């Protein structure tokens, strides 16, 4: 995908985004347990 959380956080930053941000491929794979492939 083309949207990363850091883009949102960077848009805000002093000040900072308190609420959490969806859903990137990288974030999903990093936390995943196992990949099943053909």
């Amino acid at each position: 995908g083309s949207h990363m959380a850091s883009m949102s956080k960077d848009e805000v930053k002093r000040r900072r985004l308190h609420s959490e941000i969806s859903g990137s491929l990288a974030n999903n794979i990093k936390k995943s347990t196992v990949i099943v492939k053909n």
Partner: protein
């Protein structure tokens, strides 16, 4: 398709059942597998299981009862390796 990859996520306290968090075919499948290798996520080839999951369980959906036994087996491998 030529290539299929299914990313499964199971974490006590977070997921009541294993969750298909990402799925892909062709270029997107190759991507998932390369990112899996980068992040040291175990990758297992099982052609019938990959095909059935791809057809039946969509991104963001929990696996259904027909998949409990084969998927749980893989989750147990991952727990062992971790």
């Amino acid at each position: 398709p030529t290539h299929i990859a299914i990313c499964l996520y199971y974490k006590l306290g977070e997921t009541p059942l294993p969750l298909v968090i990402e799925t892909g075919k062709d270029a997107k499948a190759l991507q998932i597998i390369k990112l899996a290798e980068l992040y040291d996520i175990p990758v297992i080839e099982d052609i019938p299981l990959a095909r059935s999951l791809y057809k039946n369980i969509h991104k963001g959906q929990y696996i259904t009862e027909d998949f409990f036994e084969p998927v749980a087996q893989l989750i147990r491998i991952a727990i062992d390796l971790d």
